[PDB]
Amino acid sequence: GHMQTLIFLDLEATGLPSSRPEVTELCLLAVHRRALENTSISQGHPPPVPRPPRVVDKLSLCIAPGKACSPGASEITGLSKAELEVQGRQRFDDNLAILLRAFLQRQPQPCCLVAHNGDRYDFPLLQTELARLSTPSPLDGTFCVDSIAALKALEQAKSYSLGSIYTRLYWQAPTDSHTAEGDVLTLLSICQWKPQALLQWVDEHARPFSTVKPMYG
Amino acid sequence: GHMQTLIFLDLEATGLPSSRPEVTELCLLAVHRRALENTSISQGHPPPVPRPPRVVDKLSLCIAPGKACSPGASEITGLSKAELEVQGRQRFDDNLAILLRAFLQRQPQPCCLVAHNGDRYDFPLLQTELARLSTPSPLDGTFCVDSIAALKALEQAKSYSLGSIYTRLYWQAPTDSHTAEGDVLTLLSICQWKPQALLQWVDEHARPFSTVKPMYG
Numbered sequence A, B: 001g002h003m004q005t006l007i008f009l010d011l012e013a014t015g016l017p018s019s020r021p022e023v024t025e026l027c028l029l030a031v032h033r034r035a036l037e038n039t040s041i042s043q044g045h046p047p048p049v050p051r052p053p054r055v056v057d058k059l060s061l062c063i064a065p066g067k068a069c070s071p072g073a074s075e076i077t078g079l080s081k082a083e084l085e086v087q088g089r090q091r092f093d094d095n096l097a098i099l100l101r102a103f104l105q106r107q108p109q110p111c112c113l114v115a116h117n118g119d120r121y122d123f124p125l126l127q128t129e130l131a132r133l134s135t136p137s138p139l140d141g142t143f144c145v146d147s148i149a150a151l152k153a154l155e156q157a158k159s160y161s162l163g164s165i166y167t168r169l170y171w172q173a174p175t176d177s178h179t180a181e182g183d184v185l186t187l188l189s190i191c192q193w194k195p196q197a198l199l200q201w202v203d204e205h206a207r208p209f210s211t212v213k214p215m216y217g
Ligand SMILES: Cc1cn([C@H]2C[C@H](O)[C@@H](COP(=O)(O)O)O2)c(=O)[nH]c1=O
Pocket: A010, A011, A012, A013, A014, A015, A016, A070, A072, A073, A076, A077, A177, A178, A179, A183
């Protein structure tokens, strides 16, 4: 193997891809290769939801968008533009790129971002947000993978919503759905089910983030 | 009403002050003053543990110390230098300072760090760790306050360990004791007990972090 760090990633946004959305919240949870492994393969029917590894770097940030959240977007995320602005949240800017860079630089390399439906939503959107900045992309040099593709490959070797996958493994609803941190913790739990097979698949399929096409722009 | 952000802060370290300890974990949770103000003032005996604000910025980092953790500190924190290093954790260095700076820069000013027993431990230690660096302190221009002093004012207006206060207030044991993030969450919950009274006290008693003397030279 060779990916040293998996960075679990989720985003909330102002709306669907067709509306040309902006990020309103993002979470990164960096776990070393070995901390993932040294969960068990979780035994029980159903198994208990595992505790995260002890050693973890986490970053969760709310981001003011330049356009308004759609009606449904505010209901499920519990974020709004007005509420983000009134609490002094800054836009997706150069300073956020430096924070992101400095955080990534603390992780052993190579690093692979891992996101649920990442190839269709999170990565394309993140690529668009960063392409607005004057600074070089902090995710240049990092890899990425979609956890849905991972889980279809591991499983097969009907709904694939994060919630549905989680409740099938654990027999409990996930908590804090559609919060970036909540959803990252939920995905981490799902990825602790067979972490050794996961890592093997990720080492096979990780692709440069630089080859992610932007959602729009 | 003049502190715009409270940043709840906890550190883990290699041991006690007489040993000349190094930071091995730090967590910062930034909450806009409006989010505290608009927490329900607690009612009941015991009141329910308060819900955290929706809009929060969080940073949690594990840090490789130069010297090993005392056996006692490893036992209570679940961290050791051995494990931090095998998981690729970096030292308390210039890049961590740039990261902290960028994080703080995203918060509306003035900012106030809030830490349980911060005056005798967290703040002097942090000041020592920042003094080793070539790059200027990112905490220059932030304020700070010890939440023990805050609660002593709000209470009287016997044990002041974090656990003792939490369970006196909420009749419940705290979770994830002696993890930086766990301890920050417990401190947030204690500070949401009388949030408006806490904010007024912080505003009156906050002091510049640059006046904090280092723990050791
Ligand atoms: C699932 C879903 C997502 N979205 C948008 C808003 C979310 O912040 C964003 C990211 O999806 P997520 O919350 O599943 O991670 O996509 C909707 O507007 N409506 C929906 O039903």
